[PDB]
Amino acid sequence: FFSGNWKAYAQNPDTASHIFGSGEGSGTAILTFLGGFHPQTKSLWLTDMAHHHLAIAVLFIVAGHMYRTNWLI
Amino acid sequence: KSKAVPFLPRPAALDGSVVGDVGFDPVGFTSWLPLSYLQEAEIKHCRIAMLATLGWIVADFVHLPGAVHEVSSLAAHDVAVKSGALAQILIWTSIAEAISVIAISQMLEGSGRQPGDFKFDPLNFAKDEKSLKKMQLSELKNGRLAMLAFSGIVTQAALTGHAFPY
Amino acid sequence: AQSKALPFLKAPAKLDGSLAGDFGFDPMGISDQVANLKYVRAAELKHCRVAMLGFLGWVVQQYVHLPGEIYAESNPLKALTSVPLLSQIQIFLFIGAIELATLDQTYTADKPWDLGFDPLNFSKGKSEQQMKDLEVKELKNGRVAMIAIMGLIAQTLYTGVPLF
Amino acid sequence: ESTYWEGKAPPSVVLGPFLSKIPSGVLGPASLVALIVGSYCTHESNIFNTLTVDTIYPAYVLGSFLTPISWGLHVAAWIQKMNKA
Ligand code: CLA
Ligand SMILES: C/C(C=C=C1C(C)(C)C[C@H](O)C[C@@]1(C)O)=C/C=C/C(C)=C/C=C/C=C(C)/C=C/C=C(/C=C/[C@@]12O[C@]1(C)C[C@@H](O)CC2(C)C)CO
Ligand SMILES: CC(/C=C/C=C(C)/C=C/[C@@]12O[C@]1(C)C[C@@H](O)CC2(C)C)=C\C=C\C=C(C)\C=C\C=C(C)\C=C\[C@@]12O[C@]1(C)C[C@@H](O)CC2(C)C
């Protein structure tokens, strides 16, 4: 994150044989684009939703500086 | 009309300031921004560049009170962000700059704070207005020279690998 | 200009004169929202006192322990879990008993931090200047302790060394 | 103040006290340059070269952000031009 090598958080995502709640077939990534659903739970990837909320957080924090307050801008 | 550029006319916003007003603004940046904000930015750049030039030069010559400090001020950045010193300096710099927002916002709004003024004269090197103006001009000239010098130092020390001559 | 702590900023309107320890330190202008400085001073002084006691307890627990085994843990954060819940609930109930009457007191009084606590009468006979000097001493020591107790907690959570 | 307007163009105060003082001859070419740069950055990050995890290029991203911006710069350029600036 500090080094800017943000791709490292997307390397080695959860495989297609991952059993939810267990380490079998898991990965190490935390923020990924995968799209679709988990092959086992038939639901969105947890790494997809974490990345989604991080992007939403950055966007809303940026957008929260729009209106004027005690600092002239 | 300008003192620095005889061809181009004198900038409209530059009439007199003890910061070294020689009327050098060919692109008219003083019309864009308030002159006070630009002066604060220039003084900040001056001080940062002077500190950085002195630190680069010294740390290449005599800087090793340990093992991780055995670098050549070109690989020093990565080594010392891994060590954790740059993190602490960044924390304190962020605190100082966050305080500086209010200082910049208290000026440009009223008050009386001159650009770049932090009331930091513990040793009282400046006594009266004449000394204050003379040393403000001296500080800004030294800071501009240090900006250019540090630019040269980094560009040369990245274009090759060497010591103080670079 | 008017701030002593930040000699360049001008302090906010509510930072002036009285309420000892006033060094003009409110860059964010938090005092501009509070109706008065009574409640924030009460909170600051409560934090100062709790932090002084916390630092003293940190050091003493580092060096001195009660005869029982349950109080033999040297790490204060580990002692937070090793100590039986009975002792901690007794401490919490004592604090809450002290806190409810002062809860009635703080939100309305002119000096919410003045709890009338002076068993040794260290303030009886002292002049106004001496009393203000004592208040300044208390506030200084409390702010330093707050910084120190937070540093101790952080260094214990980050390195496991409770001291030095 | 009084950002309300009914004439041909709004007063320059609606641009803020940073764009209110930029000559239109500066904003115009700057807006065109920003639009071209942003379009090229968008077409280099995507379209011409397909995006990949290993190829994000903050320059192209930051660049692409100049396309939305460009819109604002040339709107301000027109406002300045119509206000004799
Ligand atoms: C619980 C903490 C606490 C609280 C409630 C106060 C409250 C107050 N302080 Mg105070 N102070 C504190 C801690 C605190 N202080 C510490 C630790 C220091 C030492 C640095 C000081 C130093 C100080 C000075 C020098 C002065 C005051 C003053 C004041 C009064 C006016 C400012 C105000 O309204 O801010 C209200 C403050 C809060 C509501 C706290 C908000 C919490 C912020 C967001 C802190 C965020 C964390 C912080 C950035 C980092 C902490 C982590 C770690 C590094 C410590 C007010 C009674 C001024 C005074 O006497 O006026 C009468 C004054 O001149 N304080
Ligand atoms: C203990 C230690 C290290 C070590 C050891 C041992 C125990 C000693 C020995 C062992 O053998 C090894 C080891 C590792 O353990 C000590 C570390 C060194 C320290 C403690 C020195 C810190 C350096 C300070 C710097 C480099 C700060 C730079 C200043 C800036 C200012 C920025 C400004 O922009 C701001 C924000 C406002 C502007 O207006 C103007 C200015 C002021 C210019 C940054 O630009
Ligand atoms: C306890 C204290 C004061 C206690 C006073 C009390 C109870 C007085 C009570 C009374 O007067 C009243 C109220 C009313 C009177 O009628 C009755 C009595 C009963 C007489 C002040 C502490 C004040 C404590 C202070 C100021 C502490 C500062 C601590 C620092 C700087 C520590 C730094 C470090 O801990 C770090 C940060 C990291 C470590 O690794 C390294 C080091 C260096 C150890």
XYZ file of C-alpha atoms and ligand atoms in Angstrom:
642
model
C 0.000 0.000 0.000
C 2.696 2.497 0.973
C 5.033 1.246 -1.768
C 2.286 1.700 -4.368
C 2.462 -1.953 -5.476
C -1.289 -2.225 -4.980
C -1.474 -5.180 -7.381
C 0.036 -7.361 -4.642
C -3.273 -7.287 -2.755
C -4.962 -8.858 -5.803
C -2.442 -11.640 -6.471
C -3.463 -15.232 -5.704
C -7.245 -14.920 -5.230
C -9.495 -17.673 -3.929
C -9.544 -20.616 -6.325
C -12.616 -22.241 -7.868
C -12.381 -25.149 -5.392
C -12.395 -23.039 -2.216
C -14.625 -24.287 0.599
C -16.042 -21.312 2.489
C -14.895 -21.110 6.089
C -12.012 -23.517 5.421
C -8.456 -23.155 4.174
C -8.869 -25.721 1.399
C -8.364 -24.049 -1.966
C -8.137 -20.575 -0.445
C -5.926 -17.670 -1.471
C -4.076 -14.702 0.020
C -5.589 -11.783 -1.917
C -7.738 -9.218 -0.128
C -8.878 -6.830 -2.917
C -9.701 -8.338 -6.312
C -11.884 -8.093 -9.369
C -13.476 -11.425 -10.022
C -17.109 -10.725 -10.889
C -19.853 -13.293 -10.692
C -20.277 -15.531 -7.673
C -18.317 -17.868 -5.460
C -18.453 -21.356 -7.042
C -19.462 -22.924 -3.702
C -21.616 -20.378 -1.847
C -23.104 -18.926 -5.069
C -22.542 -15.424 -3.696
C -20.279 -12.454 -4.331
C -16.595 -12.818 -3.524
C -15.604 -11.385 -0.155
C -12.531 -9.859 -1.795
C -14.848 -8.264 -4.366
C -16.948 -6.615 -1.648
C -13.918 -5.405 0.317
C -12.555 -3.760 -2.833
C -16.011 -2.309 -3.515
C -16.228 -0.749 -0.065
C -12.664 0.577 -0.273
C -13.451 2.285 -3.582
C -16.716 3.662 -2.179
C -14.867 4.904 0.912
C -12.242 6.731 -1.143
C -14.881 8.260 -3.414
C -17.098 9.457 -0.559
C -14.194 10.807 1.502
C -13.101 12.773 -1.569
C -16.648 13.997 -2.229
C -17.023 15.095 1.395
C -14.669 18.050 0.876
C -16.929 19.790 -1.644
C -18.739 22.322 0.530
C -17.246 25.329 2.270
C -16.356 25.410 5.966
C -14.156 27.492 8.271
C -11.097 27.172 5.988
C -12.047 29.448 3.062
C -12.257 26.699 0.405
C 8.563 48.473 -16.212
C 9.739 45.266 -14.550
C 13.074 45.180 -12.741
C 13.887 41.539 -13.507
C 12.504 41.395 -17.060
C 13.122 44.745 -18.811
C 11.159 43.675 -21.900
C 7.940 42.508 -20.252
C 5.924 44.965 -18.132
C 6.033 44.904 -14.358
C 3.551 42.454 -12.785
C 0.424 44.182 -11.522
C 0.431 42.498 -8.097
C 4.165 43.036 -7.408
C 4.883 46.568 -6.178
C 6.923 46.207 -2.988
C 7.701 43.365 -0.599
C 10.799 42.739 1.520
C 10.698 39.150 0.226
C 12.808 40.171 -2.773
C 10.296 41.731 -5.166
C 12.254 42.302 -8.375
C 9.132 41.991 -10.540
C 9.816 38.516 -11.959
C 6.476 37.010 -13.008
C 6.383 36.602 -16.802
C 3.415 34.202 -16.684
C 1.445 36.401 -14.274
C 0.905 33.773 -11.586
C 0.399 36.566 -9.038
C -2.800 37.472 -10.897
C -4.065 33.889 -10.520
C -3.471 33.329 -6.798
C -3.265 35.761 -3.896
C 0.326 36.935 -3.569
C 0.378 35.868 0.086
C -0.371 32.208 -0.682
C 2.329 32.093 -3.361
C 4.790 33.712 -0.951
C 4.005 31.092 1.696
C 4.490 28.307 -0.854
C 7.792 29.819 -2.011
C 9.112 30.137 1.544
C 8.068 26.560 2.339
C 9.875 25.327 -0.773
C 12.910 27.439 0.144
C 13.210 25.974 3.633
C 12.544 22.392 2.517
C 15.112 22.659 -0.283
C 17.794 24.157 1.972
C 17.316 21.443 4.587
C 17.282 18.763 1.885
C 20.428 20.001 0.130
C 22.358 20.190 3.394
C 21.083 16.766 4.432
C 21.903 15.097 1.118
C 25.423 16.540 1.073
C 26.147 15.720 4.724
C 24.579 12.242 4.689
C 26.772 11.262 1.807
C 29.882 12.303 3.642
C 29.483 11.539 7.372
C 26.287 9.651 8.247
C 26.673 6.269 9.930
C 25.695 6.125 13.649
C 24.616 2.533 13.066
C 24.244 -0.155 10.415
C 21.113 0.798 8.445
C 22.616 4.271 7.897
C 25.359 2.952 5.567
C 23.628 4.215 2.408
C 24.466 6.890 -0.176
C 21.424 9.230 0.098
C 20.132 7.750 -3.177
C 19.132 4.334 -1.855
C 18.559 5.994 1.532
C 14.871 6.662 0.873
C 13.793 3.031 0.494
C 16.176 1.740 3.176
C 14.979 4.267 5.750
C 11.291 3.924 4.926
C 11.842 0.218 5.573
C 13.629 1.103 8.825
C 10.828 3.432 9.952
C 12.554 6.809 10.351
C 10.809 8.388 7.362
C 7.475 7.327 8.868
C 8.162 9.322 12.040
C 9.415 12.346 10.111
C 6.288 12.150 7.941
C 4.052 11.950 11.024
C 5.569 15.075 12.558
C 5.637 16.849 9.183
C 1.946 16.021 8.729
C 1.156 17.445 12.171
C 3.078 20.627 11.349
C 1.410 20.968 7.941
C -2.075 20.343 9.345
C -1.390 23.161 11.792
C -0.103 25.159 8.810
C -3.474 24.924 7.063
C -5.005 27.026 9.828
C -2.025 29.390 9.691
C -2.537 29.803 5.943
C -6.299 30.060 6.515
C -5.928 32.631 9.309
C -4.088 34.754 6.796
C -5.856 35.158 3.429
C -8.769 35.900 5.785
C -7.536 38.653 8.129
C -5.191 38.528 11.133
C -1.676 39.871 10.559
C 0.494 36.835 9.870
C 3.034 37.529 7.149
C 3.638 34.680 4.676
C 6.113 32.140 5.995
C 6.047 33.661 9.495
C 5.886 31.163 12.364
C 7.360 33.377 15.128
C 10.303 30.959 15.378
C 13.278 33.102 16.411
C 14.446 31.452 19.649
C 18.002 32.794 19.310
C 16.827 36.252 18.138
C 19.109 36.435 15.109
C 16.896 39.235 13.743
C 16.453 42.301 15.957
C 14.768 45.158 14.051
C 12.801 45.557 10.828
C 15.891 46.318 8.730
C 17.600 43.116 9.855
C 14.325 41.233 9.376
C 13.913 42.468 5.795
C 17.579 41.917 4.925
C 17.536 38.373 6.274
C 14.176 37.605 4.645
C 15.717 38.538 1.300
C 18.804 36.495 2.176
C 16.714 33.476 3.207
C 14.656 33.563 0.017
C 17.723 33.933 -2.217
C 19.438 31.050 -0.418
C 16.259 28.985 -0.693
C 15.938 29.534 -4.438
C 19.606 28.637 -4.879
C 19.021 25.537 -2.745
C 15.984 24.546 -4.820
C 18.031 24.675 -8.013
C 21.005 23.000 -6.324
C 18.956 20.096 -4.968
C 17.316 19.671 -8.367
C 20.784 19.409 -9.879
C 21.976 17.060 -7.135
C 19.146 14.568 -7.604
C 19.231 14.726 -11.404
C 23.001 14.163 -11.477
C 23.031 11.483 -8.756
C 20.348 9.644 -10.730
C 22.081 10.165 -14.089
C 25.183 8.508 -12.582
C 26.571 7.094 -9.358
C 29.171 9.213 -7.589
C 29.990 11.471 -4.626
C 29.758 15.227 -3.876
C 30.808 16.322 -7.406
C 27.917 14.218 -8.804
C -0.440 36.075 17.620
C -2.552 35.576 20.657
C -1.822 31.875 21.040
C 1.170 31.128 23.187
C 1.346 27.609 22.015
C 1.077 28.432 18.398
C 2.557 31.943 18.413
C 1.375 32.492 14.875
C -2.315 31.769 15.046
C -4.801 33.950 16.778
C -6.653 32.124 19.408
C -10.359 31.655 19.328
C -12.709 34.037 21.088
C -13.432 31.837 24.111
C -9.725 31.324 24.939
C -8.817 34.344 27.058
C -7.569 35.266 30.497
C -9.166 33.073 33.142
C -9.434 29.263 33.204
C -5.763 28.644 34.004
C -3.751 26.609 31.534
C -5.168 28.807 28.748
C -2.307 28.924 26.238
C -4.473 29.709 23.211
C -4.222 26.118 21.957
C -7.358 25.474 19.902
C -6.295 25.446 16.240
C -9.368 23.487 15.131
C -11.716 25.937 16.863
C -13.512 23.297 18.924
C -14.252 25.925 21.589
C -16.354 27.804 19.014
C -19.092 25.145 19.180
C -19.310 24.587 22.941
C -21.518 27.111 24.722
C -18.936 27.563 27.489
C -15.588 26.090 28.497
C -16.939 24.612 31.743
C -17.798 21.131 30.471
C -14.724 20.744 28.265
C -12.501 21.848 31.152
C -14.261 19.347 33.419
C -13.632 16.581 30.879
C -10.004 17.636 30.392
C -9.369 17.665 34.141
C -11.067 14.295 34.621
C -8.852 12.894 31.870
C -5.803 14.525 33.468
C -6.524 12.991 36.875
C -7.360 9.549 35.471
C -4.188 9.628 33.365
C -2.021 10.634 36.331
C -3.452 7.743 38.336
C -3.021 5.434 35.348
C 0.645 6.316 34.872
C 1.330 5.903 38.590
C -0.440 2.543 38.573
C 1.443 1.465 35.454
C 4.822 2.123 37.071
C 3.877 0.691 40.473
C 2.414 -2.481 38.944
C 5.655 -2.729 36.981
C 7.612 -2.711 40.246
C 5.232 -3.493 43.148
C 2.489 -6.115 43.449
C -0.058 -7.151 46.051
C 0.737 -10.269 48.121
C -1.854 -12.382 46.310
C -1.118 -14.444 43.225
C -3.924 -12.971 41.100
C -2.083 -9.622 41.234
C 1.273 -11.112 40.176
C 0.998 -10.101 36.510
C 3.591 -7.481 35.595
C 2.152 -6.455 32.222
C -0.765 -4.078 32.942
C -2.613 -5.043 29.762
C -2.166 -8.731 30.585
C -3.232 -8.013 34.167
C -6.409 -6.524 32.685
C -7.406 -10.105 31.811
C -5.547 -12.063 34.508
C -7.146 -10.141 37.390
C -10.496 -11.708 38.390
C -13.642 -9.963 37.201
C -14.686 -9.432 40.835
C -11.939 -6.873 41.472
C -12.620 -5.013 38.228
C -16.384 -4.925 38.769
C -15.818 -3.609 42.303
C -13.569 -0.860 40.922
C -16.137 -0.039 38.229
C -18.982 0.103 40.759
C -16.953 2.410 43.013
C -16.199 4.674 40.055
C -19.850 4.691 38.982
C -20.989 5.562 42.497
C -18.580 8.501 42.446
C -19.706 9.299 38.896
C -23.498 9.488 39.274
C -23.555 12.345 41.803
C -20.956 14.178 39.730
C -23.136 13.414 36.691
C -25.908 15.409 38.316
C -23.289 18.040 39.205
C -21.293 18.550 35.997
C -23.889 19.492 33.379
C -25.205 22.487 35.362
C -22.517 23.889 37.667
C -20.171 26.808 37.041
C -17.084 24.775 38.049
C -17.934 21.144 37.222
C -14.340 20.058 37.899
C -14.555 21.366 41.489
C -15.705 18.197 43.237
C -14.916 19.568 46.693
C -12.085 17.048 47.102
C -9.466 18.460 49.468
C -9.126 16.153 52.504
C -5.681 17.506 53.445
C -6.760 21.154 52.940
C -3.881 21.988 50.605
C -5.942 24.941 49.315
C -7.107 26.435 52.628
C -5.230 29.697 53.125
C -3.713 29.794 49.636
C -4.048 33.071 47.759
C -5.650 33.450 44.341
C -2.298 33.540 42.532
C -1.127 30.426 44.388
C -4.407 28.647 43.621
C -4.095 29.501 39.923
C -0.492 28.276 39.969
C -1.660 24.991 41.506
C -4.322 24.651 38.802
C -1.689 25.268 36.114
C 0.568 22.632 37.690
C -2.283 20.119 37.737
C -3.217 20.773 34.111
C 0.364 20.551 32.875
C 1.096 17.343 34.734
C -2.188 15.869 33.532
C -1.566 16.654 29.871
C 1.928 15.166 30.085
C 0.515 12.065 31.800
C -2.211 11.651 29.169
C 0.444 11.704 26.461
C 2.557 9.324 28.552
C -0.214 6.860 29.404
C -1.290 6.694 25.761
C 2.337 6.095 24.802
C 2.653 3.315 27.372
C -0.525 1.634 26.118
C 0.649 1.915 22.507
C 4.125 0.543 23.232
C 2.674 -2.359 25.224
C 0.231 -3.169 22.415
C 2.949 -2.845 19.750
C 6.036 -4.383 21.397
C 4.913 -6.107 24.608
C 7.404 -4.124 26.716
C 5.280 -2.288 29.331
C 8.030 0.195 30.240
C 11.151 1.568 28.523
C -21.489 38.025 -4.867
C -24.898 37.613 -6.546
C -24.140 34.592 -8.710
C -27.669 34.904 -10.133
C -27.615 36.062 -13.748
C -30.029 36.701 -16.605
C -27.861 38.081 -19.422
C -25.866 36.191 -22.039
C -23.155 34.832 -19.718
C -22.828 34.515 -15.934
C -20.514 36.897 -14.071
C -16.941 35.757 -13.563
C -17.569 35.349 -9.814
C -19.210 31.965 -10.496
C -15.781 30.598 -11.477
C -14.346 31.119 -7.994
C -11.547 33.482 -6.983
C -8.981 31.420 -8.871
C -10.604 31.051 -12.303
C -12.175 34.520 -12.167
C -8.735 35.985 -12.956
C -7.504 33.576 -15.651
C -7.558 35.156 -19.134
C -9.748 33.275 -21.594
C -6.764 32.968 -23.935
C -5.159 30.828 -21.233
C -8.186 28.740 -20.221
C -9.201 27.909 -23.795
C -5.970 26.338 -25.034
C -5.477 24.800 -21.588
C -8.929 23.216 -21.813
C -8.221 21.835 -25.289
C -4.837 20.469 -24.187
C -6.392 18.872 -21.103
C -9.152 17.277 -23.188
C -6.663 15.873 -25.708
C -4.357 14.589 -22.956
C -7.232 12.976 -21.071
C -8.649 11.324 -24.180
C -5.210 9.961 -25.068
C -4.659 8.692 -21.519
C -8.052 6.961 -21.532
C -7.347 5.436 -24.953
C -3.910 4.261 -23.815
C -5.042 2.706 -20.529
C -7.987 1.040 -22.303
C -9.369 0.692 -25.849
C -5.978 0.582 -27.580
C -4.411 -1.627 -24.886
C -6.657 -3.843 -22.777
C -6.495 -3.218 -19.042
C -4.746 -5.677 -16.739
C -3.876 -5.879 -13.047
C -0.191 -5.317 -13.835
C -0.934 -2.264 -16.048
C -2.793 0.551 -14.257
C -0.435 3.521 -14.782
C -1.473 6.318 -12.386
C -0.409 8.780 -15.105
C -3.102 7.468 -17.453
C -5.582 7.341 -14.605
C -4.786 10.724 -13.288
C -4.678 11.776 -16.884
C -8.063 10.428 -17.716
C -9.312 12.562 -14.867
C -8.489 15.612 -17.076
C -11.297 14.712 -19.460
C -14.041 15.407 -16.923
C -11.977 18.424 -15.859
C -11.473 19.651 -19.419
C -15.248 20.114 -19.552
C -15.048 22.531 -16.672
C -12.014 24.379 -18.011
C -13.569 25.181 -21.368
C -16.880 26.133 -19.754
C -14.890 28.611 -17.658
C -12.996 29.707 -20.781
C -16.254 30.574 -22.540
C -17.525 32.374 -19.436
C -14.327 34.441 -19.260
C -14.397 35.202 -22.994
C -17.978 36.473 -22.863
C -17.168 38.625 -19.803
C -14.381 40.537 -21.620
C -11.545 38.650 -19.947
C -9.337 14.276 26.748
C -8.478 15.137 26.198
C -8.544 16.576 26.257
C -9.614 17.438 26.388
C -11.048 17.174 26.512
C -9.053 18.820 26.381
C -9.835 19.982 26.511
C -9.359 21.278 26.439
N -8.070 21.692 26.249
Mg -6.471 20.357 26.116
N -4.801 19.114 25.961
C -4.855 17.747 25.969
C -6.039 16.958 26.051
C -7.315 17.417 26.175
N -7.702 18.772 26.263
C -3.510 17.196 25.844
C -3.181 15.771 25.831
C -2.641 18.283 25.745
C -1.178 18.237 25.599
C -0.751 18.357 24.154
C -3.462 19.487 25.816
C -2.975 20.803 25.757
C -3.753 21.940 25.819
C -3.322 23.355 25.754
C -1.931 23.792 25.636
C -4.481 24.112 25.815
C -5.596 23.150 25.936
C -6.870 23.795 26.018
C -8.032 23.090 26.169
C -9.431 23.686 26.316
C -9.881 24.364 25.032
C -9.652 23.499 23.809
C -10.880 22.699 23.498
O -12.064 23.015 23.632
O -10.588 21.460 23.003
C -11.457 20.377 23.391
C -10.733 19.132 23.037
C -11.359 17.997 22.692
C -12.835 17.901 22.632
C -10.593 16.772 22.338
C -10.911 16.308 20.930
C -10.100 15.087 20.557
C -9.147 15.374 19.404
C -9.800 15.021 18.084
C -7.828 14.634 19.608
C -7.523 13.615 18.533
C -6.326 12.757 18.886
C -5.027 13.550 18.855
C -4.881 14.315 17.555
C -3.824 12.638 19.056
C -3.967 11.799 20.309
C -3.153 10.523 20.238
C -1.797 10.634 20.928
C -0.726 11.161 19.994
C -1.879 11.490 22.173
C -10.312 22.456 26.629
C -10.825 22.518 28.042
C -6.602 25.279 25.971
C -7.120 25.923 27.224
O -6.591 25.929 28.338
O -8.320 26.550 27.075
C -9.058 26.857 28.259
C -5.057 25.446 25.823
O -4.503 26.536 25.732
N -5.167 21.891 25.946
C 17.662 7.128 17.633
C 17.957 7.577 16.254
C 18.447 6.551 15.325
C 19.205 5.577 15.745
C 19.954 4.630 16.227
C 20.929 4.902 17.378
C 20.360 4.363 18.696
C 21.162 6.410 17.533
C 22.271 4.216 17.085
C 22.141 2.775 16.622
O 23.435 2.249 16.325
C 21.260 2.683 15.389
C 19.863 3.212 15.653
C 19.019 3.150 14.393
O 19.310 2.321 16.645
C 17.754 8.918 15.929
C 17.181 9.446 14.789
C 17.322 10.720 14.276
C 16.504 11.841 14.482
C 15.615 11.848 15.665
C 16.486 12.957 13.634
C 15.469 13.396 12.810
C 15.511 14.154 11.648
C 14.744 15.226 11.239
C 14.359 15.571 9.939
C 15.078 14.944 8.812
C 13.327 16.472 9.648
C 13.144 17.233 8.513
C 12.433 18.412 8.404
C 11.351 18.690 7.584
C 10.610 19.875 7.719
C 9.556 20.190 6.963
C 8.930 21.547 6.774
O 7.999 21.623 5.669
C 7.494 21.719 7.027
C 6.635 20.568 7.467
C 7.012 23.093 7.367
C 7.640 24.074 6.399
O 7.142 25.383 6.663
C 9.154 24.084 6.508
C 9.809 22.780 6.991
C 10.120 22.968 8.478
C 11.119 22.652 6.212
C 10.966 17.693 6.524
O 11.091 18.283 5.252
C 0.246 11.057 40.058
C 0.268 12.556 39.995
C -0.349 13.352 41.067
C -1.033 12.780 42.051
C -1.583 13.647 43.085
C -2.548 13.263 43.927
C -3.146 11.890 43.860
C -2.991 14.235 44.939
C -4.133 14.139 45.610
C -4.388 15.244 46.620
O -4.064 16.580 46.208
C -5.455 16.257 46.164
C -6.049 15.855 44.810
C -6.305 16.928 47.246
C -5.543 16.989 48.552
O -6.289 17.720 49.527
C -5.388 15.548 48.986
C -4.382 14.826 48.102
C -4.644 13.328 48.194
C -2.981 15.064 48.652
C 0.862 13.185 38.973
C 1.510 12.413 37.922
C 1.995 12.995 36.831
C 2.657 12.121 35.877
C 3.323 12.567 34.806
C 3.430 14.029 34.492
C 3.969 11.547 33.969
C 4.745 11.796 32.922
C 5.275 10.586 32.316
C 6.191 10.515 31.345
C 6.809 11.736 30.732
C 6.554 9.153 30.925
C 7.241 8.835 29.835
C 7.469 7.344 29.649
O 6.334 6.481 29.836
C 6.664 6.760 28.474
C 5.845 7.838 27.753
C 7.294 5.584 27.722
C 8.213 4.802 28.635
O 8.690 3.639 27.957
C 9.359 5.743 28.937
C 8.897 6.822 29.904
C 9.871 7.990 29.842
C 8.941 6.250 31.316
